[PDB]
Amino acid sequence: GLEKLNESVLKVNELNKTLNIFEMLRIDEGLRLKIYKDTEGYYTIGIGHLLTKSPSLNAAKSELDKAIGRNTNGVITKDEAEKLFNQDVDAAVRGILRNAKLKPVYDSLDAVRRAALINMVFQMGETGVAGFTNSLRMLQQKRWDEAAVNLAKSRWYNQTPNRAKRVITTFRTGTWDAYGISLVKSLTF
């Protein structure tokens, strides 16, 4: 078994030679390189990048063409998907720091828990995340056990329990064991 493991890690290193919050939001939401519809019926692409809520069919293609600045038929690439993802993350974090209801907590936490908060914002919207006052206070005060005990009691918990559980363990340990290319490397490690 160990010999086969070394062989597989060598294969991994080779595939890498041939070739992060992005992987987290990929595992939770899901990535698509072609235009599809989300659970609410709106037009999304990439990772949660909402193209258009309008009933218009071609209203998503024009949004994409104006966003990435290219005349693609709706088939984007990997690096441009991550570029749109970083753009959306920048927008969400700007909204977070501007609202100020989340700014003290976000400034109190480290990078991992910041990415977890950004995941919550991407999922339910900054307005919905602002409705976790107790959890937010326990996060800025850096009481992790009680914060996870509290986050497990919400509509956000019953609705999507697995994603909530992963985000909650990420808040707890402050690591990437949950959600763990880079993944194959770390995990074979």
PDB file of all heavy atoms in Angstrom, residues 20-31 47 119 163 166 176 178-180 183:
ATOM      1  N   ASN A  20      -6.403  28.126  -0.312  1.00  0.00           N
ATOM      2  CA  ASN A  20      -7.018  29.105  -1.201  1.00  0.00           C
ATOM      3  C   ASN A  20      -8.542  29.052  -1.068  1.00  0.00           C
ATOM      4  O   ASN A  20      -9.142  27.980  -1.131  1.00  0.00           O
ATOM      5  CB  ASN A  20      -6.590  28.852  -2.652  1.00  0.00           C
ATOM      6  CG  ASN A  20      -6.740  30.081  -3.533  1.00  0.00           C
ATOM      7  OD1 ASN A  20      -6.928  31.194  -3.042  1.00  0.00           O
ATOM      8  ND2 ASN A  20      -6.652  29.883  -4.845  1.00  0.00           N
ATOM      9  N   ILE A  21      -9.159  30.221  -0.876  1.00  0.00           N
ATOM     10  CA  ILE A  21     -10.610  30.307  -0.729  1.00  0.00           C
ATOM     11  C   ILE A  21     -11.338  29.817  -1.974  1.00  0.00           C
ATOM     12  O   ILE A  21     -12.507  29.410  -1.894  1.00  0.00           O
ATOM     13  CB  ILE A  21     -11.009  31.760  -0.390  1.00  0.00           C
ATOM     14  CG1 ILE A  21     -12.522  31.873  -0.200  1.00  0.00           C
ATOM     15  CG2 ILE A  21     -10.535  32.715  -1.482  1.00  0.00           C
ATOM     16  CD1 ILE A  21     -12.978  33.245   0.248  1.00  0.00           C
ATOM     17  N   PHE A  22     -10.674  29.853  -3.131  1.00  0.00           N
ATOM     18  CA  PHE A  22     -11.315  29.437  -4.374  1.00  0.00           C
ATOM     19  C   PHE A  22     -11.729  27.970  -4.314  1.00  0.00           C
ATOM     20  O   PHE A  22     -12.849  27.617  -4.694  1.00  0.00           O
ATOM     21  CB  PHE A  22     -10.370  29.693  -5.552  1.00  0.00           C
ATOM     22  CG  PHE A  22     -10.920  29.257  -6.879  1.00  0.00           C
ATOM     23  CD1 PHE A  22     -11.847  30.036  -7.552  1.00  0.00           C
ATOM     24  CD2 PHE A  22     -10.506  28.069  -7.457  1.00  0.00           C
ATOM     25  CE1 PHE A  22     -12.353  29.636  -8.774  1.00  0.00           C
ATOM     26  CE2 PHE A  22     -11.009  27.664  -8.680  1.00  0.00           C
ATOM     27  CZ  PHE A  22     -11.933  28.450  -9.339  1.00  0.00           C
ATOM     28  N   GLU A  23     -10.842  27.100  -3.825  1.00  0.00           N
ATOM     29  CA  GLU A  23     -11.184  25.684  -3.711  1.00  0.00           C
ATOM     30  C   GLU A  23     -12.325  25.472  -2.723  1.00  0.00           C
ATOM     31  O   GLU A  23     -13.195  24.620  -2.938  1.00  0.00           O
ATOM     32  CB  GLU A  23      -9.956  24.879  -3.282  1.00  0.00           C
ATOM     33  CG  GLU A  23      -8.825  24.874  -4.297  1.00  0.00           C
ATOM     34  CD  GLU A  23      -9.117  24.014  -5.513  1.00  0.00           C
ATOM     35  OE1 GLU A  23      -9.283  22.787  -5.343  1.00  0.00           O
ATOM     36  OE2 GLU A  23      -9.191  24.564  -6.635  1.00  0.00           O
ATOM     37  N   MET A  24     -12.330  26.231  -1.627  1.00  0.00           N
ATOM     38  CA  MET A  24     -13.412  26.128  -0.653  1.00  0.00           C
ATOM     39  C   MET A  24     -14.755  26.441  -1.302  1.00  0.00           C
ATOM     40  O   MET A  24     -15.692  25.631  -1.259  1.00  0.00           O
ATOM     41  CB  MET A  24     -13.138  27.075   0.518  1.00  0.00           C
ATOM     42  CG  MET A  24     -14.219  27.099   1.591  1.00  0.00           C
ATOM     43  SD  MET A  24     -13.886  28.344   2.853  1.00  0.00           S
ATOM     44  CE  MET A  24     -15.285  28.113   3.945  1.00  0.00           C
ATOM     45  N   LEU A  25     -14.866  27.622  -1.918  1.00  0.00           N
ATOM     46  CA  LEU A  25     -16.122  27.998  -2.556  1.00  0.00           C
ATOM     47  C   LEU A  25     -16.436  27.131  -3.769  1.00  0.00           C
ATOM     48  O   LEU A  25     -17.589  27.103  -4.212  1.00  0.00           O
ATOM     49  CB  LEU A  25     -16.090  29.474  -2.955  1.00  0.00           C
ATOM     50  CG  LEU A  25     -16.572  30.472  -1.897  1.00  0.00           C
ATOM     51  CD1 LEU A  25     -18.036  30.241  -1.544  1.00  0.00           C
ATOM     52  CD2 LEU A  25     -15.707  30.386  -0.649  1.00  0.00           C
ATOM     53  N   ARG A  26     -15.443  26.427  -4.318  1.00  0.00           N
ATOM     54  CA  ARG A  26     -15.726  25.442  -5.355  1.00  0.00           C
ATOM     55  C   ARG A  26     -16.393  24.209  -4.762  1.00  0.00           C
ATOM     56  O   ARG A  26     -17.364  23.688  -5.323  1.00  0.00           O
ATOM     57  CB  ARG A  26     -14.433  25.048  -6.074  1.00  0.00           C
ATOM     58  CG  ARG A  26     -14.626  24.022  -7.185  1.00  0.00           C
ATOM     59  CD  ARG A  26     -13.311  23.643  -7.849  1.00  0.00           C
ATOM     60  NE  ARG A  26     -12.545  22.686  -7.053  1.00  0.00           N
ATOM     61  CZ  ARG A  26     -11.424  22.098  -7.462  1.00  0.00           C
ATOM     62  NH1 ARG A  26     -10.929  22.363  -8.665  1.00  0.00           N
ATOM     63  NH2 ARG A  26     -10.799  21.238  -6.669  1.00  0.00           N
ATOM     64  N   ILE A  27     -15.884  23.733  -3.626  1.00  0.00           N
ATOM     65  CA  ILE A  27     -16.445  22.537  -3.007  1.00  0.00           C
ATOM     66  C   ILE A  27     -17.850  22.814  -2.486  1.00  0.00           C
ATOM     67  O   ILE A  27     -18.749  21.973  -2.612  1.00  0.00           O
ATOM     68  CB  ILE A  27     -15.517  22.026  -1.890  1.00  0.00           C
ATOM     69  CG1 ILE A  27     -14.156  21.630  -2.468  1.00  0.00           C
ATOM     70  CG2 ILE A  27     -16.152  20.838  -1.173  1.00  0.00           C
ATOM     71  CD1 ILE A  27     -13.123  21.290  -1.420  1.00  0.00           C
ATOM     72  N   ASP A  28     -18.069  23.991  -1.896  1.00  0.00           N
ATOM     73  CA  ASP A  28     -19.373  24.285  -1.306  1.00  0.00           C
ATOM     74  C   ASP A  28     -20.419  24.565  -2.380  1.00  0.00           C
ATOM     75  O   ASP A  28     -21.391  23.816  -2.531  1.00  0.00           O
ATOM     76  CB  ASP A  28     -19.263  25.467  -0.340  1.00  0.00           C
ATOM     77  CG  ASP A  28     -18.848  25.045   1.059  1.00  0.00           C
ATOM     78  OD1 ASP A  28     -18.914  23.836   1.365  1.00  0.00           O
ATOM     79  OD2 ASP A  28     -18.457  25.921   1.859  1.00  0.00           O
ATOM     80  N   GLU A  29     -20.238  25.650  -3.135  1.00  0.00           N
ATOM     81  CA  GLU A  29     -21.226  26.034  -4.139  1.00  0.00           C
ATOM     82  C   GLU A  29     -21.216  25.066  -5.316  1.00  0.00           C
ATOM     83  O   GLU A  29     -22.225  24.415  -5.612  1.00  0.00           O
ATOM     84  CB  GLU A  29     -20.954  27.465  -4.612  1.00  0.00           C
ATOM     85  CG  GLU A  29     -21.924  27.981  -5.668  1.00  0.00           C
ATOM     86  CD  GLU A  29     -23.307  28.253  -5.108  1.00  0.00           C
ATOM     87  OE1 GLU A  29     -23.402  28.715  -3.951  1.00  0.00           O
ATOM     88  OE2 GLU A  29     -24.299  28.003  -5.824  1.00  0.00           O
ATOM     89  N   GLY A  30     -20.078  24.957  -5.998  1.00  0.00           N
ATOM     90  CA  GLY A  30     -19.978  24.159  -7.204  1.00  0.00           C
ATOM     91  C   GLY A  30     -19.601  25.006  -8.401  1.00  0.00           C
ATOM     92  O   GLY A  30     -20.123  26.111  -8.574  1.00  0.00           O
ATOM     93  N   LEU A  31     -18.696  24.502  -9.234  1.00  0.00           N
ATOM     94  CA  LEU A  31     -18.178  25.245 -10.373  1.00  0.00           C
ATOM     95  C   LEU A  31     -18.759  24.694 -11.668  1.00  0.00           C
ATOM     96  O   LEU A  31     -18.971  23.484 -11.803  1.00  0.00           O
ATOM     97  CB  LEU A  31     -16.647  25.179 -10.410  1.00  0.00           C
ATOM     98  CG  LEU A  31     -15.930  25.858 -11.581  1.00  0.00           C
ATOM     99  CD1 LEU A  31     -16.227  27.348 -11.653  1.00  0.00           C
ATOM    100  CD2 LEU A  31     -14.431  25.629 -11.471  1.00  0.00           C
ATOM    101  N   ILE A  47     -18.620  30.251 -10.102  1.00  0.00           N
ATOM    102  CA  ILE A  47     -18.885  29.967  -8.697  1.00  0.00           C
ATOM    103  C   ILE A  47     -19.824  31.055  -8.194  1.00  0.00           C
ATOM    104  O   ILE A  47     -19.386  32.153  -7.829  1.00  0.00           O
ATOM    105  CB  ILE A  47     -17.596  29.909  -7.870  1.00  0.00           C
ATOM    106  CG1 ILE A  47     -16.714  28.761  -8.364  1.00  0.00           C
ATOM    107  CG2 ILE A  47     -17.921  29.744  -6.388  1.00  0.00           C
ATOM    108  CD1 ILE A  47     -15.430  28.573  -7.579  1.00  0.00           C
ATOM    109  N   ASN A 119     -17.794  33.094   2.738  1.00  0.00           N
ATOM    110  CA  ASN A 119     -18.641  32.016   2.235  1.00  0.00           C
ATOM    111  C   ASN A 119     -20.080  32.199   2.696  1.00  0.00           C
ATOM    112  O   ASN A 119     -21.025  32.036   1.913  1.00  0.00           O
ATOM    113  CB  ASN A 119     -18.100  30.663   2.701  1.00  0.00           C
ATOM    114  CG  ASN A 119     -18.872  29.488   2.118  1.00  0.00           C
ATOM    115  OD1 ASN A 119     -19.955  29.655   1.556  1.00  0.00           O
ATOM    116  ND2 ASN A 119     -18.318  28.289   2.260  1.00  0.00           N
ATOM    117  N   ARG A 163     -22.951  21.993   4.336  1.00  0.00           N
ATOM    118  CA  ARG A 163     -22.155  23.198   4.123  1.00  0.00           C
ATOM    119  C   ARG A 163     -22.017  23.988   5.418  1.00  0.00           C
ATOM    120  O   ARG A 163     -20.935  24.504   5.731  1.00  0.00           O
ATOM    121  CB  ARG A 163     -22.791  24.050   3.022  1.00  0.00           C
ATOM    122  CG  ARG A 163     -22.020  25.313   2.657  1.00  0.00           C
ATOM    123  CD  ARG A 163     -22.649  26.011   1.458  1.00  0.00           C
ATOM    124  NE  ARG A 163     -21.905  27.199   1.046  1.00  0.00           N
ATOM    125  CZ  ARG A 163     -22.249  27.983   0.028  1.00  0.00           C
ATOM    126  NH1 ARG A 163     -23.330  27.714  -0.691  1.00  0.00           N
ATOM    127  NH2 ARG A 163     -21.513  29.043  -0.275  1.00  0.00           N
ATOM    128  N   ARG A 166     -19.449  22.254   7.621  1.00  0.00           N
ATOM    129  CA  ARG A 166     -18.083  22.493   7.164  1.00  0.00           C
ATOM    130  C   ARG A 166     -17.625  23.900   7.536  1.00  0.00           C
ATOM    131  O   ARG A 166     -16.518  24.089   8.057  1.00  0.00           O
ATOM    132  CB  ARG A 166     -17.985  22.273   5.651  1.00  0.00           C
ATOM    133  CG  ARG A 166     -18.122  20.816   5.214  1.00  0.00           C
ATOM    134  CD  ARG A 166     -17.612  20.600   3.791  1.00  0.00           C
ATOM    135  NE  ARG A 166     -18.389  21.320   2.782  1.00  0.00           N
ATOM    136  CZ  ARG A 166     -19.449  20.826   2.146  1.00  0.00           C
ATOM    137  NH1 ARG A 166     -19.882  19.598   2.404  1.00  0.00           N
ATOM    138  NH2 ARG A 166     -20.081  21.565   1.243  1.00  0.00           N
ATOM    139  N   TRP A 176      -7.983  24.215   7.367  1.00  0.00           N
ATOM    140  CA  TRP A 176      -8.592  23.757   6.125  1.00  0.00           C
ATOM    141  C   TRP A 176      -8.735  22.241   6.091  1.00  0.00           C
ATOM    142  O   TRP A 176      -8.903  21.662   5.013  1.00  0.00           O
ATOM    143  CB  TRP A 176      -7.769  24.235   4.929  1.00  0.00           C
ATOM    144  CG  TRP A 176      -7.453  25.695   4.975  1.00  0.00           C
ATOM    145  CD1 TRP A 176      -6.400  26.279   5.614  1.00  0.00           C
ATOM    146  CD2 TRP A 176      -8.185  26.758   4.354  1.00  0.00           C
ATOM    147  NE1 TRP A 176      -6.431  27.640   5.434  1.00  0.00           N
ATOM    148  CE2 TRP A 176      -7.517  27.960   4.663  1.00  0.00           C
ATOM    149  CE3 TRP A 176      -9.340  26.812   3.568  1.00  0.00           C
ATOM    150  CZ2 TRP A 176      -7.964  29.199   4.215  1.00  0.00           C
ATOM    151  CZ3 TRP A 176      -9.782  28.045   3.124  1.00  0.00           C
ATOM    152  CH2 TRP A 176      -9.096  29.221   3.449  1.00  0.00           C
ATOM    153  N   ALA A 178     -11.311  20.424   7.088  1.00  0.00           N
ATOM    154  CA  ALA A 178     -12.527  20.444   6.292  1.00  0.00           C
ATOM    155  C   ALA A 178     -12.246  21.176   4.988  1.00  0.00           C
ATOM    156  O   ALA A 178     -11.516  22.170   4.963  1.00  0.00           O
ATOM    157  CB  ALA A 178     -13.661  21.122   7.058  1.00  0.00           C
ATOM    158  N   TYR A 179     -12.813  20.668   3.899  1.00  0.00           N
ATOM    159  CA  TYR A 179     -12.552  21.092   2.526  1.00  0.00           C
ATOM    160  C   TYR A 179     -11.220  20.537   2.027  1.00  0.00           C
ATOM    161  O   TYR A 179     -10.857  20.797   0.872  1.00  0.00           O
ATOM    162  CB  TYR A 179     -12.539  22.621   2.360  1.00  0.00           C
ATOM    163  CG  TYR A 179     -13.795  23.314   2.839  1.00  0.00           C
ATOM    164  CD1 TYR A 179     -13.847  23.908   4.094  1.00  0.00           C
ATOM    165  CD2 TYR A 179     -14.925  23.384   2.037  1.00  0.00           C
ATOM    166  CE1 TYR A 179     -14.989  24.546   4.536  1.00  0.00           C
ATOM    167  CE2 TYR A 179     -16.068  24.020   2.472  1.00  0.00           C
ATOM    168  CZ  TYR A 179     -16.096  24.599   3.720  1.00  0.00           C
ATOM    169  OH  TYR A 179     -17.235  25.234   4.157  1.00  0.00           O
ATOM    170  N   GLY A 180     -10.480  19.794   2.845  1.00  0.00           N
ATOM    171  CA  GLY A 180      -9.199  19.248   2.436  1.00  0.00           C
ATOM    172  C   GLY A 180      -9.317  17.858   1.843  1.00  0.00           C
ATOM    173  O   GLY A 180      -8.805  16.889   2.402  1.00  0.00           O
ATOM    174  N   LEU A 183      -5.526  20.174  -3.214  1.00  0.00           N
ATOM    175  CA  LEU A 183      -6.171  19.216  -2.324  1.00  0.00           C
ATOM    176  C   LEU A 183      -5.503  17.850  -2.416  1.00  0.00           C
ATOM    177  O   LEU A 183      -5.197  17.231  -1.391  1.00  0.00           O
ATOM    178  CB  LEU A 183      -7.660  19.112  -2.661  1.00  0.00           C
ATOM    179  CG  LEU A 183      -8.510  20.362  -2.417  1.00  0.00           C
ATOM    180  CD1 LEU A 183      -9.965  20.089  -2.771  1.00  0.00           C
ATOM    181  CD2 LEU A 183      -8.389  20.838  -0.978  1.00  0.00           C
TER     182      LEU A 183
END
